[PDB]
Amino acid sequence: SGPGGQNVNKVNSKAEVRFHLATAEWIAEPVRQKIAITHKNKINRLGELILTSESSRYQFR
Amino acid sequence: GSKAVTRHRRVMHFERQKLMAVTEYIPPKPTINPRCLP
Amino acid sequence: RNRIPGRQWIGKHRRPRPVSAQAKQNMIRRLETEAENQYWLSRPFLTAEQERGHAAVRRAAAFQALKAAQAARFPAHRRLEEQLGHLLVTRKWS
RNA sequence: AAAAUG
RNA sequence: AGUAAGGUCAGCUAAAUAAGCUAUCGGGCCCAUACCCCGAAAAUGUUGGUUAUACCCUUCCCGUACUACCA
RNA sequence: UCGGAGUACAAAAAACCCUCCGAGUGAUUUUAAUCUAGACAAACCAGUCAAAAUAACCAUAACAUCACUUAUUGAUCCAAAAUUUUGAUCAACGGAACAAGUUACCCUAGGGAUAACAGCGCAAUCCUGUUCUAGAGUUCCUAUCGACAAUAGGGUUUACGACCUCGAUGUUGGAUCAGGACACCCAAAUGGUGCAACCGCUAUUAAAGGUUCGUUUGUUCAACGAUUAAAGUCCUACGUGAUCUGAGUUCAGACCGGAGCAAUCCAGGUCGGUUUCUAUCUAUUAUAAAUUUCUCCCAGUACGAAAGGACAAGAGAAAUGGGACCAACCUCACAAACGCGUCUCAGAGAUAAUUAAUGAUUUAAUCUUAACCUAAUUAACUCAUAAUAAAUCCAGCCCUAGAACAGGGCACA
RNA sequence: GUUUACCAAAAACAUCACCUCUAGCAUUACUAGUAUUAGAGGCAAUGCCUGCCCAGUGACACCAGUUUAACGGCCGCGGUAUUCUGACCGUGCAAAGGUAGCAUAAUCACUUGUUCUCCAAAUAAGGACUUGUAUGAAUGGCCACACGAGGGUUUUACUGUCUCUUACUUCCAAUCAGUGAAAUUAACCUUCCCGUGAAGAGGCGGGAAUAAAAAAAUAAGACGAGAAGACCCUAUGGAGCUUUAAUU
RNA sequence: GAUAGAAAUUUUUAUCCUGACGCUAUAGAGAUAGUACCGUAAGGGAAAGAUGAAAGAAUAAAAUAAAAGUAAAAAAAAGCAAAGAUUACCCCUUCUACCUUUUGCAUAAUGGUUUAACCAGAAAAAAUCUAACAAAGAGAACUUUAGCUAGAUACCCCGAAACCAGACGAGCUACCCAUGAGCAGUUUAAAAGAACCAACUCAUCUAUGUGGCAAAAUAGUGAGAAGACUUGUAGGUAGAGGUGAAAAGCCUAACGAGCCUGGUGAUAGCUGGUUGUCCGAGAAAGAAUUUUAGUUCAACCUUAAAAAUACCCCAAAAACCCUAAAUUCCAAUGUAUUUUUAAGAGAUAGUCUAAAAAGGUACAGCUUUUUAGAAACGGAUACAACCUUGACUAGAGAGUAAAAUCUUAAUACUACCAUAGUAGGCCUAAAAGCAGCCAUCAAUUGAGAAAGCGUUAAAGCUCAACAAAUUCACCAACAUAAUCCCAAAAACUAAUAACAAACUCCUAGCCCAAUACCGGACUAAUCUAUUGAAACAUAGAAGCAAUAAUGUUAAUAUGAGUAACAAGAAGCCUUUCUC
Ligand SMILES: Nc1nc2c(ncn2[C@@H]2O[C@H](COP(=O)(O)O)[C@@H](O)[C@H]2O)c(=O)[nH]1
Ligand SMILES: Nc1nc2c(ncn2[C@@H]2O[C@H](COP(=O)(O)O)[C@@H](O)[C@H]2O)c(=O)[nH]1
Ligand SMILES: [Mg+2]
Ligand SMILES: [Mg+2]
Ligand SMILES: [Mg+2]
Ligand SMILES: [Mg+2]
Ligand SMILES: [Mg+2]
Ligand SMILES: [Mg+2]
Ligand SMILES: [Mg+2]
Ligand SMILES: [Mg+2]
Ligand SMILES: [Mg+2]
Ligand SMILES: [Mg+2]
Ligand SMILES: [Mg+2]
Ligand SMILES: [Mg+2]
Ligand SMILES: [Mg+2]
Ligand SMILES: [Mg+2]
Ligand SMILES: [Mg+2]
Ligand SMILES: [Mg+2]
Ligand SMILES: [Mg+2]
Ligand SMILES: [Mg+2]
Ligand SMILES: [Mg+2]
Ligand SMILES: [Mg+2]
Ligand SMILES: [Mg+2]
Ligand SMILES: [Mg+2]
Ligand SMILES: [Mg+2]
Ligand SMILES: [Mg+2]
Ligand SMILES: [Mg+2]
Ligand SMILES: [Mg+2]
Ligand SMILES: [Mg+2]
Ligand SMILES: [Mg+2]
Ligand SMILES: [Mg+2]
Ligand SMILES: [Mg+2]
Ligand SMILES: [Mg+2]
Ligand SMILES: [Mg+2]
Ligand SMILES: [Mg+2]
Ligand SMILES: [Mg+2]
Ligand SMILES: [Mg+2]
Ligand SMILES: [Mg+2]
Ligand SMILES: [Mg+2]
Ligand SMILES: [Mg+2]
Ligand SMILES: [Mg+2]
Ligand SMILES: [Mg+2]
Ligand SMILES: [Mg+2]
Ligand SMILES: [Mg+2]
Ligand SMILES: [Mg+2]
Ligand SMILES: [Mg+2]
Ligand SMILES: [Mg+2]
Ligand SMILES: [Mg+2]
Ligand SMILES: [Mg+2]
Ligand SMILES: [Mg+2]
Ligand SMILES: [Mg+2]
Ligand SMILES: [Mg+2]
Ligand SMILES: [Mg+2]
Ligand SMILES: [Mg+2]
Ligand SMILES: [Mg+2]
Ligand SMILES: [Mg+2]
Ligand SMILES: [Mg+2]
Ligand SMILES: [Mg+2]
Ligand SMILES: [Mg+2]
Ligand SMILES: [Mg+2]
Ligand SMILES: [Mg+2]
Ligand SMILES: [Mg+2]
Ligand SMILES: [Mg+2]
Ligand SMILES: [Mg+2]
Ligand SMILES: [Mg+2]
Ligand SMILES: [Mg+2]
Ligand SMILES: [Mg+2]
Ligand SMILES: [Mg+2]
Ligand SMILES: [Mg+2]
Ligand SMILES: [Mg+2]
Ligand SMILES: [Mg+2]
Ligand SMILES: [Mg+2]
Ligand SMILES: [Mg+2]
Ligand SMILES: [Mg+2]
Ligand SMILES: [Mg+2]
Ligand SMILES: [Mg+2]
Ligand SMILES: [Mg+2]
Ligand SMILES: [Mg+2]
Ligand SMILES: [Mg+2]
Ligand SMILES: [Mg+2]
Ligand SMILES: [Mg+2]
Ligand SMILES: [Mg+2]
Ligand SMILES: [Mg+2]
Ligand SMILES: [Mg+2]
Ligand SMILES: [Mg+2]
Ligand SMILES: [Mg+2]
Ligand SMILES: [Mg+2]
Ligand SMILES: [Mg+2]
Ligand SMILES: [Mg+2]
Ligand SMILES: [Mg+2]
Ligand SMILES: [Mg+2]
Ligand SMILES: [Mg+2]
Ligand SMILES: [Mg+2]
Ligand SMILES: [Mg+2]
Ligand SMILES: [Mg+2]
Ligand SMILES: [Mg+2]
Ligand SMILES: [Mg+2]
Ligand SMILES: [Mg+2]
Ligand SMILES: [Mg+2]
Ligand SMILES: [Mg+2]
Ligand SMILES: [Mg+2]
Ligand SMILES: [Mg+2]
Ligand SMILES: [Mg+2]
Ligand SMILES: [Mg+2]
Ligand SMILES: [Mg+2]
Ligand SMILES: [Mg+2]
Ligand SMILES: [Mg+2]
Ligand SMILES: [Mg+2]
Ligand SMILES: [Mg+2]
Ligand SMILES: [Mg+2]
Ligand SMILES: [Mg+2]
Ligand SMILES: [Mg+2]
Ligand SMILES: [Mg+2]
Ligand SMILES: [Mg+2]
Ligand SMILES: [Mg+2]
Ligand SMILES: [Mg+2]
Ligand SMILES: [Mg+2]
Ligand SMILES: [Mg+2]
Ligand SMILES: [Mg+2]
Ligand SMILES: [Mg+2]
Ligand SMILES: [Mg+2]
Ligand SMILES: [Mg+2]
Ligand SMILES: [Mg+2]
Ligand SMILES: [Mg+2]
Ligand SMILES: [Mg+2]
Ligand SMILES: [Mg+2]
Ligand SMILES: [Mg+2]
Ligand SMILES: [Mg+2]
Ligand SMILES: [Mg+2]
Ligand SMILES: [Mg+2]
Ligand SMILES: [Mg+2]
Ligand SMILES: [Mg+2]
Ligand SMILES: [Mg+2]
Ligand SMILES: [Mg+2]
Ligand SMILES: [Mg+2]
Ligand SMILES: [Mg+2]
Ligand SMILES: [Mg+2]
Ligand SMILES: [Mg+2]
Ligand SMILES: [Mg+2]
Ligand SMILES: [Mg+2]
Ligand SMILES: [Mg+2]
Ligand SMILES: [Mg+2]
Ligand SMILES: [Mg+2]
Ligand SMILES: [Mg+2]
Ligand SMILES: [Mg+2]
Ligand SMILES: [Mg+2]
Ligand SMILES: [Mg+2]
Ligand SMILES: [Mg+2]
Ligand SMILES: [Mg+2]
Ligand SMILES: [Mg+2]
Ligand SMILES: [Mg+2]
Ligand SMILES: [Mg+2]
Ligand SMILES: [Mg+2]
Ligand SMILES: [Mg+2]
């Protein structure tokens, strides 16, 4: 979203990273519980945590 | 314009293809099969 | 259905057009001809020391003839006939 | 003039 | 991703005579601490080449700030 | 701007916003002249050497030397010099004597020579399969995964290129209609299971048909509520504005925060903001021969220590879709039209994956890119079957037939 | 109340009120007026108020010095109470280091910040927490009555907006009679699929299709018509605006 | 710098001989006329005529019936509309309309409906040719070490936003100044910048309309409606300005600064166009530059002229740690080309293939350097760059060249049996062939302190050992996209076949392609001087040739007889009925 004209209209530049927390073995268990407690608003009912990025114009950024 | 060394086998120019086909190896074939020749 | 990317005979992926038996036979015939050529080009009649200036007066004469022909370039002669023949355009019957 | 606490 | 300024004693400001106030230690003052009065130690984050000196410029790690716009 | 090295391997030259060193000068005395052959290099301007001959010192050298020695430098004009010189990070360095920003209030000449959208090339990125077994999995690589690695394929995202269009290829989401691919969500047939049964996890084949209704956001996405057999991934100018919508983006107005002294600026947000076309051509303008869920038994039967709990077969109910119709209800002040109302919806062959019979190469076995007939078998797809299917009377008048043209009736009465 | 006549009527402008500055005065404005007056301006009634600064640039003063209801700015680094914090302290620069108030706002991004109410569900709305390191006090900050074709959110009532459209009339529409334009047009005897090609073919290639003409509709295409792209770039091409640009 | 540019001093003899190698109604003045018409005004400003001696010869007579557009006479599969042809219109075969711009255009890049009339190269400094005279030339002023004089050879059209000067505009609109006029009803002690709602004034939202009723409208719906309100007449403020409750608004339908005239044929490195035939040769980029959208040189190339060496080039020769393809210089030889002299313009915005490299991703139809090649009318189905091919004309002759279906789609290994020291020795709860370490002996002809499964440890199931035979037995097989698959087909009659060009022979010749630029020979139509007089010749001149500029004017076509427009009824004829 935002003003970019045809560029924003027809360029996929909004990034979203979604991943399950319970089975994420690359994060320590107490850290996983702490994230599940503090960021419960960003976690849906399937346990998948979602983060999104819209600020930068570039998809890689 | 590709490099001298590539990964896609560098499809060859037609005259070089003809040269390779002409210079393909031809094994010597005897007149009679020696398996159950005497 | 089957597309050739880019142009047909330029890109990294080209047409897989193969070599034919006619092409192979033509190449073999040309190779045999060239082999005969290089066989005939093996033994000269005269050697390099025997051919030293064997034909030089003819080359000098040819160059002199070319020089004379080039130096002869010059405008032609203007005669009285060329000027007086234009008067005939009004030749009438009396 | 100055200068706290136990 | 780029550009600008950088990395100082245990803490901050400096300037190349590496100093000035805090902090530390050892004393004195006091009944005991604190204030105060003395003495000492305390480093340019690192590699290289230099100069009469270094506030010269580069390599390796650190925090940083601003920009990333027209579509 | 100038020089050195590689690119540029061996006469010369040779480029990139190619990879590295530097230079915009210091120190010393031998303070290094005049004139003139002949040559190097070079578009030009410039830069380079230099034999002989002359002036002063040995009566035998003078190229000033060193710091990679190569670069250490600037043209006219004009100013200052006074007889002979100098003066510029003119560094944009072949140099205009001295001139900044912003324009979304903008204008003009052009460019697809040059970007944003689309198309196209490549596949860095992305997505797939297979190859390799160390490891997880109580033993056990492959029930389910599988690090370091290999090969090949697809062109959905972004990036890269700048080839078609800038004397116009109208740009997101939705409304309507959807065409297609299978890398399948369901529906169908199977294999393996760490499959006893139900839920499951993977693997193969199958695209005739479907893939919901709402709150918030312009939203694609996303979060949540209720369901479903399912709320699939894509291509289609990431379909479709000469069919539509204008909420956002994308003009002119105006605020807030920041930058700028200002004009102004914003992939930073808020309100408001003209969406034209009378169809010339291509194209097109109705034959059918169904699908899927839910209830009753099957049966608390098989299967199990019990909790749990089937498949198949058969009866029905519905829903969607195709084709139709007003006896009643409802819309209905025309006799008609219409849904919210009513009726109907199908047999055979055929197969892909996968099971077994018989049997040699390979006298055992083995479903057979060995034959013979085989049998259980998905969806499609064709065919039975169903519809039209009696030519030359057509003035006028009606019609449940119709734009016009056509078509059905005009003897009962 | 006024405004972009012809895409924007507004949250923009103006406005009563409050503040500044500039003027001791006569025959055409101001004004036939005389500081309780008249101009050049800012902000907006009213209520609580308007905190610090002349360091810089302006203006008075022709130098010092005064001015912010002038242009405008109102801080770092580090450790500390018992763990989060830091009442406190050390040190440095300043002209002062952002006071009161309000606060996820019309207020960069993180943002759909966290929480409560409303709904079955809310990136919507309202109330609270709050460094907003880019809020902030006459370029004014906070609340309040009345007000507004301004912008958002609810409660019923209402209904074809919608589930899901249907029926009937008028103008349309089709036929007869009369009159009779327009953009556009290289020529067309103007098909479909795949591939190719200046990288999206009716004209090429390989195949399919193919008596010829009307009339009524739908718009997928003719990269359809309309305007020598308004977006982007170039031009030793313009013009508006502002200055700390250069000559004046 | 671009450029500007004298004077001192010299020459100039009265009058007639004057008309036109200027045009004939898209030309020549704008003119039949500054009139109609467009504009408030300044100002802009046209097109329009054709009989004859007689039309006081209109039952009127004679020459063309030749442009585009129609009718006579609509069309019959298929295709840039044509050609080869053919008994025959089609049917058969073959060619991707034309200019411009580009590396490359059928491109879906630009332009054009058609016809007619107009519309675009202009200069003589230096040079070439010809001629007169010549150490001198020229009809006065100067030039001269073969030069002076004379003549012929030469260099376009259209297009801006803009700047300045002077006029004309406040009858629309912005604001004022005089003079007038309006606001009915209702609630209110009120004429309160109050409230409801009329006339009236604005224009919030939506739907039609979008070449429409309208260059801003209609319908529904809205706000104000005793005031900072509307509105009539007259006047003023005029562009470096006016005015503005700032929208950078309005100032006569386009205002970030009006319109007209003049400068003005403004200027454009930018776009478009540039008009007869044939022939010869014929160019893809090194250096500077407010320069890469262009100019100026060099290297190439064109027309002339002088000469003599020019390409291929054997030895020999060209550096020092290693270094390939190969380069420079020269004999000889096979060819005729090369260098200077004097005129010169174009081009300096480029693609692919093969090779050497770099950047990127050992990615591109990618970008940057060096060598070579190409841009067929044949072949690779279509095609720019790949291959064959020293490009003229006629033939209903022939011989050749490159070239036409490219390869495998493949992995069977079966019987026969297994007893003994012994649980070999160590740690471990256990290690019995098998978590681990060391030895790895020895019985039966025949069997490893055990090469794979399995148990907690065993046990148990397989391998190799004998006895029974003895085909061969090492690796090699791998899914996919979207409108509809893509010539059809074919394993054996003899193949170094055959068919196949712009190649080469044959028969005759007028005897070899081309973009920008350059040179030459002819020539269409006019006027003039001489010929000629059923329309030509030699000379001299130009308003000297149009398939193309969103070209101007006039007439025509397609769209199209389409969109679109109107009059209430009957009647005794203008009398009655419906709104
Ligand atoms: N210094 C210098 N100035 C020159 C030269 N040539 C021309 N100029 C001009 O002369 C002027 C000198 O003025 P200045 O700068 O000394 O006041 C400048 O405009 C400069 O550009 C030169 O060679 N040297
Ligand atoms: N610079 C240059 N351009 C050429 C040359 N030949 C042709 N051209 C250019 O190429 C274009 C035409 O292409 P062609 O007709 O030669 O195929 C034109 O732009 C023309 O100027 C040449 O030799 N050199
Ligand atoms: Mg938004
Ligand atoms: Mg915006
Ligand atoms: Mg923007
Ligand atoms: Mg994109
Ligand atoms: Mg290459
Ligand atoms: Mg292609
Ligand atoms: Mg290709
Ligand atoms: Mg205390
Ligand atoms: Mg030389
Ligand atoms: Mg000498
Ligand atoms: Mg320059
Ligand atoms: Mg330069
Ligand atoms: Mg140079
Ligand atoms: Mg704006
Ligand atoms: Mg323009
Ligand atoms: Mg391009
Ligand atoms: Mg280019
Ligand atoms: Mg891009
Ligand atoms: Mg693109
Ligand atoms: Mg396209
Ligand atoms: Mg790429
Ligand atoms: Mg690939
Ligand atoms: Mg394991
Ligand atoms: Mg390029
Ligand atoms: Mg374009
Ligand atoms: Mg066009
Ligand atoms: Mg176009
Ligand atoms: Mg289109
Ligand atoms: Mg569909
Ligand atoms: Mg499948
Ligand atoms: Mg299923
Ligand atoms: Mg489907
Ligand atoms: Mg598009
Ligand atoms: Mg896309
Ligand atoms: Mg795509
Ligand atoms: Mg779309
Ligand atoms: Mg759309
Ligand atoms: Mg439309
Ligand atoms: Mg469309
Ligand atoms: Mg909008
Ligand atoms: Mg506010
Ligand atoms: Mg913005
Ligand atoms: Mg908006
Ligand atoms: Mg509005
Ligand atoms: Mg039609
Ligand atoms: Mg229509
Ligand atoms: Mg039970
Ligand atoms: Mg059942
Ligand atoms: Mg039904
Ligand atoms: Mg058997
Ligand atoms: Mg069996
Ligand atoms: Mg049938
Ligand atoms: Mg009938
Ligand atoms: Mg006003
Ligand atoms: Mg108004
Ligand atoms: Mg408006
Ligand atoms: Mg309003
Ligand atoms: Mg409005
Ligand atoms: Mg205001
Ligand atoms: Mg007050
Ligand atoms: Mg206030
Ligand atoms: Mg204040
Ligand atoms: Mg001050
Ligand atoms: Mg002061
Ligand atoms: Mg608060
Ligand atoms: Mg507030
Ligand atoms: Mg609030
Ligand atoms: Mg914010
Ligand atoms: Mg909202
Ligand atoms: Mg809502
Ligand atoms: Mg909210
Ligand atoms: Mg709130
Ligand atoms: Mg602030
Ligand atoms: Mg503020
Ligand atoms: Mg202020
Ligand atoms: Mg304000
Ligand atoms: Mg309002
Ligand atoms: Mg309101
Ligand atoms: Mg109002
Ligand atoms: Mg109805
Ligand atoms: Mg009609
Ligand atoms: Mg036209
Ligand atoms: Mg046809
Ligand atoms: Mg072509
Ligand atoms: Mg094109
Ligand atoms: Mg195609
Ligand atoms: Mg075809
Ligand atoms: Mg064909
Ligand atoms: Mg076929
Ligand atoms: Mg269409
Ligand atoms: Mg076409
Ligand atoms: Mg168009
Ligand atoms: Mg243009
Ligand atoms: Mg535009
Ligand atoms: Mg612009
Ligand atoms: Mg330039
Ligand atoms: Mg200029
Ligand atoms: Mg100018
Ligand atoms: Mg200045
Ligand atoms: Mg100059
Ligand atoms: Mg005339
Ligand atoms: Mg005619
Ligand atoms: Mg034909
Ligand atoms: Mg041109
Ligand atoms: Mg191009
Ligand atoms: Mg060109
Ligand atoms: Mg094209
Ligand atoms: Mg075209
Ligand atoms: Mg163009
Ligand atoms: Mg053209
Ligand atoms: Mg056209
Ligand atoms: Mg001359
Ligand atoms: Mg000027
Ligand atoms: Mg007036
Ligand atoms: Mg008036
Ligand atoms: Mg009243
Ligand atoms: Mg009132
Ligand atoms: Mg109205
Ligand atoms: Mg209505
Ligand atoms: Mg009202
Ligand atoms: Mg009111
Ligand atoms: Mg001016
Ligand atoms: Mg003004
Ligand atoms: Mg404004
Ligand atoms: Mg503005
Ligand atoms: Mg006007
Ligand atoms: Mg011009
Ligand atoms: Mg240029
Ligand atoms: Mg030629
Ligand atoms: Mg060429
Ligand atoms: Mg040699
Ligand atoms: Mg030689
Ligand atoms: Mg030249
Ligand atoms: Mg150029
Ligand atoms: Mg290229
Ligand atoms: Mg070349
Ligand atoms: Mg061809
Ligand atoms: Mg040839
Ligand atoms: Mg033994
Ligand atoms: Mg055995
Ligand atoms: Mg598969
Ligand atoms: Mg032949
Ligand atoms: Mg001949
Ligand atoms: Mg020939
Ligand atoms: Mg003549
Ligand atoms: Mg002419
Ligand atoms: Mg003509
Ligand atoms: Mg024309
Ligand atoms: Mg007609
Ligand atoms: Mg029509
Ligand atoms: Mg009509
Ligand atoms: Mg009427």
PDB file of C-alpha atoms (C1' of nucleotides) in Angstrom, chain F residues 7 9-11 14-15 43 77 95-96 105 107-110 113 121-122 124 128-129 139 153 156 160-161 164-165 167-168 180-181 183 234-235 253-254 274 276 278 280 362, chain H residues 1 102 104-105 109-110 160-161 210-211 216 247-248 256 270-271 289-290 293 297-298 323-328 349 357 361 363-364 366 368-369 412 454 479-482 560:
ATOM      1  C1'   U F   7      43.337  -6.725 -19.496  1.00  0.00           C
ATOM      2  C1'   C F   9      51.030 -13.360 -23.660  1.00  0.00           C
ATOM      3  C1'   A F  10      55.466 -11.916 -29.407  1.00  0.00           C
ATOM      4  C1'   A F  11      56.098  -4.419 -34.170  1.00  0.00           C
ATOM      5  C1'   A F  14      43.127  -0.448 -28.519  1.00  0.00           C
ATOM      6  C1'   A F  15      37.675   0.570 -24.362  1.00  0.00           C
ATOM      7  C1'   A F  43      43.705  14.818 -36.812  1.00  0.00           C
ATOM      8  C1'   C F  77      43.281  37.014 -25.114  1.00  0.00           C
ATOM      9  C1'   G F  95      40.232  26.048 -20.375  1.00  0.00           C
ATOM     10  C1'   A F  96      32.969  30.663 -21.708  1.00  0.00           C
ATOM     11  C1'   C F 105       0.621  25.744 -12.131  1.00  0.00           C
ATOM     12  C1'   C F 107       4.894  24.950 -21.798  1.00  0.00           C
ATOM     13  C1'   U F 108       7.370  23.645 -26.619  1.00  0.00           C
ATOM     14  C1'   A F 109      10.534  20.254 -30.303  1.00  0.00           C
ATOM     15  C1'   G F 110      11.580  15.229 -30.106  1.00  0.00           C
ATOM     16  C1'   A F 113      18.019   6.216 -29.308  1.00  0.00           C
ATOM     17  C1'   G F 121      15.728 -13.015 -23.535  1.00  0.00           C
ATOM     18  C1'   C F 122      18.403 -15.303 -18.977  1.00  0.00           C
ATOM     19  C1'   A F 124      20.773 -14.567  -9.928  1.00  0.00           C
ATOM     20  C1'   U F 128       9.656 -28.834  -8.918  1.00  0.00           C
ATOM     21  C1'   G F 129      11.103 -33.585  -9.292  1.00  0.00           C
ATOM     22  C1'   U F 139      16.893 -51.569  16.800  1.00  0.00           C
ATOM     23  C1'   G F 153      13.147 -29.389 -15.885  1.00  0.00           C
ATOM     24  C1'   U F 156       4.225 -17.416 -10.928  1.00  0.00           C
ATOM     25  C1'   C F 160      19.135  -8.018 -14.632  1.00  0.00           C
ATOM     26  C1'   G F 161      18.729  -6.527 -20.038  1.00  0.00           C
ATOM     27  C1'   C F 164       8.320  -3.712 -29.911  1.00  0.00           C
ATOM     28  C1'   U F 165       5.555   0.503 -28.987  1.00  0.00           C
ATOM     29  C1'   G F 167       2.032  11.616 -33.891  1.00  0.00           C
ATOM     30  C1'   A F 168      -0.628   6.933 -26.399  1.00  0.00           C
ATOM     31  C1'   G F 180      -6.936 -23.399 -20.393  1.00  0.00           C
ATOM     32  C1'   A F 181      -2.527 -26.298 -17.727  1.00  0.00           C
ATOM     33  C1'   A F 183       2.490 -29.391 -10.051  1.00  0.00           C
ATOM     34  C1'   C F 234      -1.189 -20.778 -11.714  1.00  0.00           C
ATOM     35  C1'   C F 235      -1.432 -18.753 -17.077  1.00  0.00           C
ATOM     36  C1'   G F 253      -7.075  22.916  -3.549  1.00  0.00           C
ATOM     37  C1'   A F 254      -5.821  22.169   1.754  1.00  0.00           C
ATOM     38  C1'   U F 274     -15.084  15.113 -15.519  1.00  0.00           C
ATOM     39  C1'   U F 276     -15.749   9.728 -24.115  1.00  0.00           C
ATOM     40  C1'   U F 278     -23.428   6.164 -33.005  1.00  0.00           C
ATOM     41  C1'   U F 280     -16.301  -0.524 -40.579  1.00  0.00           C
ATOM     42  C1'   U F 362      15.915 -68.269 -17.847  1.00  0.00           C
TER      43        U F 362
ATOM     44  C1'   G H   1      35.785  36.464 -30.403  1.00  0.00           C
ATOM     45  C1'   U H 102      16.261   2.727 -37.866  1.00  0.00           C
ATOM     46  C1'   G H 104      17.017  -4.230 -38.107  1.00  0.00           C
ATOM     47  C1'   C H 105       9.898  -2.341 -40.172  1.00  0.00           C
ATOM     48  C1'   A H 109       6.534   2.349 -35.658  1.00  0.00           C
ATOM     49  C1'   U H 110       5.042   7.379 -38.728  1.00  0.00           C
ATOM     50  C1'   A H 160       6.932  26.087 -31.920  1.00  0.00           C
ATOM     51  C1'   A H 161       6.479  27.465 -26.668  1.00  0.00           C
ATOM     52  C1'   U H 210     -20.250  13.350 -23.454  1.00  0.00           C
ATOM     53  C1'   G H 211     -20.004  16.228 -31.729  1.00  0.00           C
ATOM     54  C1'   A H 216     -20.891  23.193 -18.699  1.00  0.00           C
ATOM     55  C1'   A H 247      -8.067  29.768  -5.780  1.00  0.00           C
ATOM     56  C1'   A H 248      -1.256  31.936  -8.091  1.00  0.00           C
ATOM     57  C1'   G H 256       1.979  30.966 -13.789  1.00  0.00           C
ATOM     58  C1'   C H 270      14.596  18.664 -32.993  1.00  0.00           C
ATOM     59  C1'   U H 271      10.371  16.060 -36.448  1.00  0.00           C
ATOM     60  C1'   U H 289      34.444  19.419 -28.004  1.00  0.00           C
ATOM     61  C1'   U H 290      28.704  22.398 -21.790  1.00  0.00           C
ATOM     62  C1'   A H 293      20.510  13.968 -30.895  1.00  0.00           C
ATOM     63  C1'   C H 297      40.106  17.056 -38.305  1.00  0.00           C
ATOM     64  C1'   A H 298      42.566  12.222 -39.385  1.00  0.00           C
ATOM     65  C1'   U H 323      54.631 -18.164 -22.380  1.00  0.00           C
ATOM     66  C1'   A H 324      49.722 -20.262 -27.839  1.00  0.00           C
ATOM     67  C1'   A H 325      47.170 -18.724 -32.263  1.00  0.00           C
ATOM     68  C1'   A H 326      50.528 -15.587 -34.603  1.00  0.00           C
ATOM     69  C1'   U H 327      52.373 -10.122 -35.910  1.00  0.00           C
ATOM     70  C1'   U H 328      56.337  -6.043 -38.119  1.00  0.00           C
ATOM     71  C1'   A H 349      23.629   7.359 -32.871  1.00  0.00           C
ATOM     72  C1'   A H 357      39.356 -11.369 -22.973  1.00  0.00           C
ATOM     73  C1'   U H 361      25.394 -15.313 -12.557  1.00  0.00           C
ATOM     74  C1'   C H 363      22.699 -15.069 -17.372  1.00  0.00           C
ATOM     75  C1'   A H 364      20.955 -13.049 -21.466  1.00  0.00           C
ATOM     76  C1'   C H 366      23.393  -8.051 -22.142  1.00  0.00           C
ATOM     77  C1'   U H 368      32.845  -2.861 -23.166  1.00  0.00           C
ATOM     78  C1'   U H 369      38.046  -3.731 -26.438  1.00  0.00           C
ATOM     79  C1'   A H 412      16.369 -61.762 -14.080  1.00  0.00           C
ATOM     80  C1'   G H 454      18.244 -60.383  14.792  1.00  0.00           C
ATOM     81  C1'   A H 479       7.696 -35.954 -14.777  1.00  0.00           C
ATOM     82  C1'   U H 480       5.912 -31.550 -16.011  1.00  0.00           C
ATOM     83  C1'   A H 481       1.807 -25.376 -18.217  1.00  0.00           C
ATOM     84  C1'   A H 482      -1.449 -23.051 -19.589  1.00  0.00           C
ATOM     85  C1'   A H 560     -24.561   5.988 -44.471  1.00  0.00           C
TER      86        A H 560
END
